[PDB]
Amino acid sequence: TLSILVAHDLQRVIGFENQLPWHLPNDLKHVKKLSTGHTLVMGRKTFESIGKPLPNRRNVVLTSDTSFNVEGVDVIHSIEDIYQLPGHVFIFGGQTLFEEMIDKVDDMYITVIEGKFRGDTFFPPYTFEDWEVASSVEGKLDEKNTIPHTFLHLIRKK
Ligand SMILES: NC(=O)C1=CN([C@@H]2O[C@H](COP(=O)(O)OP(=O)(O)OC[C@H]3O[C@@H](n4cnc5c(N)ncnc54)[C@H](OP(=O)(O)O)[C@@H]3O)[C@@H](O)[C@H]2O)C=CC1
Ligand SMILES: COc1cc(Cc2cnc(N)nc2N)c2c(c1OC)O[C@@H](C1CC1)C=C2
C-alpha cells in the first residue's frame, strides 16, 4: 500500500525554509501512529530537515547523491525503486516527492492546518472530484496545540 502523508495549510503550504511553518505536537503524534512499524519514503532535503532517521520504522531517502550512506537509512536513487519496497509505504515529503507521487498513490493522509502561513514549498493542487473522504476528524485544541486542524484520509476515486 502506497500512501501520501502530509500536513498542509489552507493554501497548501507545506514548508518554510526547510522546516514546518507550524508548531503542532498532535500532528507529529499522528504521523508517529501511522508510520511506526512501516516505511517512510522521503527526499534528501526533507531527510536533512529531520536530520536523523525516525525511530521504529524503515527510513528510505531518495537522492541523486551516490555518496549517500547514512546509518539507519536505506538509499534509493530513482522514483521507480519506490514500488519495490514491501509493506505500507508512506510518501513523506517534500514538495518534489509529493508532486511526483500524487498521481500514483492509492490514498493520502492529509492534515489540513486551518491557517494561512508564509511558505516556500507547497502541496500540489488536487480535487475532491478525484478523492473520496474515507474520514474527516477534527484535531483537538489545547495548551500545546493551538491551531485548528483536520485529519483527512482520502482514497483515489473510481
Ligand atoms: N508539511 C509536511 O507534511 C512536510 C513538509 N516538508 C517540507 O517540504 C520542503 C522540502 O521540499 P523540497 O524542497 O521539494 O525537497 P524534497 O524533500 O522533496 O527533496 C528534494 C530532493 O529529493 C531528491 N529527489 C527528488 N526526486 C528525485 C528523483 N526522482 N531522483 C533522485 N533524487 C530525487 C533530490 O535530492 P538530491 O538533490 O540530493 O539528489 C532533490 O533535490 C521543506 O520545506 C519541508 O519543510 C517535507 C515533508 C513533509
Ligand atoms: C519538514 O520538516 C518536517 C517534516 C515532517 C513530515 C511530516 C509532518 N507532518 C505530516 N503530517 N506529514 C509529514 N510527512 C516531519 C517532521 C519535520 O520536522 C522535524 O518532524 C517529525 C517529528 C519529529 C518527529 C515528523 C515529521
Side-chain angles (χ1 to χ4, degrees), residues 5-7 20 27-28 31 92 111:
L5 181 57
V6 67
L20 298 165
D27 172 58
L28 302 174
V31 171
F92 184 68
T111 311

Side-chain angles (χ1 to χ4, degrees), residues 14-143:
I14 59 161
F16 190 52
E17 286 174 346
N18 287 321
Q19 314 154 59
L20 298 165
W22 40 81
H23 167 57
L24 204 53
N26 286 15
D27 172 58
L28 302 174
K29 182 157 181 44
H30 179 248
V31 171
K32 196 184 217 211
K33 203 141 170 114
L34 276 184
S35 63
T36 286
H38 301 294
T39 297
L40 308 177
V41 169
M42 85 188 70
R44 187 261 311 175
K45 308 194 170 193
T46 293
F47 172 67
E48 254 135 60
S49 284
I50 73 221
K52 43 198 314 158
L54 293 188
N56 292 137
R57 60 216 100 166
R58 173 163 198 196
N59 290 246
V60 178
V61 174
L62 169 66
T63 176
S64 64
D65 178 11
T66 54
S67 266
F68 196 91
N69 184 352
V70 175
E71 262 323 318
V73 169
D74 304 27
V75 115
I76 60 168
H77 281 308
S78 75
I79 288 275
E80 196 84 4
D81 291 333
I82 286 176
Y83 307 110
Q84 318 321 325
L85 310 164
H88 196 183
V89 170
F90 301 83
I91 307 308
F92 184 68
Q95 170 165 345
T96 68
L97 251 310
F98 291 143
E99 284 173 0
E100 301 183 278
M101 281 324 276
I102 184 150
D103 286 345
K104 327 264 151 195
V105 292
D106 316 326
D107 67 336
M108 312 194 292
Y109 297 82
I110 300 179
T111 311
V112 187
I113 319 283
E114 321 284 8
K116 292 191 176 175
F117 294 76
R118 134 124 41 46
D120 60 21
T121 40
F122 283 75
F123 201 70
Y126 62 94
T127 313
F128 289 100
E129 249 287 332
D130 281 14
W131 293 101
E132 131 149 288
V133 173
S135 37
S136 184
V137 183
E138 289 186 34
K140 332 275 225 158
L141 306 213
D142 56 48
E143 226 56 28

Side-chain angles (χ1 to χ4, degrees), residues 144-157:
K144 301 137 182 340
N145 303 252
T146 58
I147 327 135
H149 51 290
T150 306
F151 309 111
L152 292 182
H153 180 209
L154 308 173
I155 305 189
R156 189 176 307 282
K157 282 206 206 142

